[PDB]
Design a protein around this ligand. Structure first.
Ligand SMILES: [Zn+2]
Length: 318
């Protein structure tokens, strides 16, 4: 038998389409919308105040219209997506993002070194994301608002804050949401008696290789067993992509200046390690979270190396 007091607020799932709602000041936001967020903070267990008049609240996609709007923006209708994204955003907005040598890094916290390495890599390769939420956060990440982008990365990769991570695993997850269908790779394997056989790779597989860190060795030739037994030679004949990513288990490797875009250093064992990002500019730079180190040459345990590419064709011919 208690009076009703009302204020008008806005609900959204993408912060682009706002939906006017009139709420009762006697019930909580959870009792009317479900899980509700106001500027990242969970406001489910509280009641509307006059200070909420006209503000915009995040909600989970329960309505038919909200599912469509969430699908066009995030490319997913998973109900636990926003939940995991808001939980991650609660940590990433508390992180420090120093501007290390014109790039945006992350101060070490909650084992975020693999995210920092990946975020630095994403700022040095040409890449377009299909989900609008990622592409919007990608540009603001290059500007400086990387807290929102790191939360999306964690949410898309299904990785909770504080857990150890893999840079290559993180990159390949994001590559699925990238427009890489125009990338093309032509490989050629030659055997001494079986003969020669060429295959073509498109999409994500055209920009990743697991076997050697050296882009040059991939062009000169890598030894690969044949179905007949003896050792064959595989070479990269044609490559069309904005970049290539060469990966291998962490081994001591020398990075010569000007021969790559950036690389991933991994120190430690398979159970627990430490990620550092090496980048090549006027000289060799080493970004370790908030720390920076120069040197003319570099020698350390590398696991991923990124190269710039546009169009490469050998003239040898098959
Ligand atoms: Zn053979």
């Amino acid at each position: 038998m208690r009076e009703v007091r009302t204020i008008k607020v806005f609900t959204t799932v993408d912060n682009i389409n706002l939906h006017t709602q009139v709420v009762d000041m006697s019930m909580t936001y959870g009792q009317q919308f479900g899980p509700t967020y106001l500027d990242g903070a969970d406001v489910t267990k509280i009641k509307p105040h006059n200070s909420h008049e006209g503000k915009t609240f995040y909600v989970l996609p329960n309505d038919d219209t909200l599912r469509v709007e969430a699908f066009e923006y995030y490319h997913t209708t998973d109900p636990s997506f926003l939940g995991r994204y808001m939980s991650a955003l609660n940590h990433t907005k508390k992180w420090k993002y120093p501007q290390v040598n014109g790039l945006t890094s992350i101060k070490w916290a909650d084992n975020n070194c693999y995210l920092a390495t990946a975020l630095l890599t994403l700022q040095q390769i040409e890449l377009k994301f299909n989900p609008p939420a990622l592409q919007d956060a990608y540009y603001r990440a290059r500007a400086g608002e990387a807290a929102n982008f790191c939360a999306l990365i964690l949410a898309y990769c299904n990785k909770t804050v504080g857990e150890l991570g893999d840079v290559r695993e993180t990159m390949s997850y994001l590559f699925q949401h990238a427009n890489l269908d125009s990338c093309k790779r032509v490989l050629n394997v030659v055997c001494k008696t079986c003969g020669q056989q060429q295959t073509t790779l498109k999409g994500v597989e055209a920009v990743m290789y697991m076997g050697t860190l050296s882009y040059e060795q991939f062009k000169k030739g890598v030894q690969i067993p044949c179905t007949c037994g003896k050792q064959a030679t595989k070479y990269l004949v044609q490559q069309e992509s904005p970049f290539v990513m060469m990966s291998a288990p962490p081994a001591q490797y020398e990075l010569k200046h000007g021969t790559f875009t950036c690389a991933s250093e991994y120190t430690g064992n398979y159970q627990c390690g430490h990620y550092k990002h090496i980048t090549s500019k006027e000289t060799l730079y080493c970004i370790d979270g908030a720390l920076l180190t120069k040197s003319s040459e570099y020698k350390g345990p590398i696991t991923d190396v990124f190269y710039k590419e546009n169009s490469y064709t050998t003239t040898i011919k098959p």
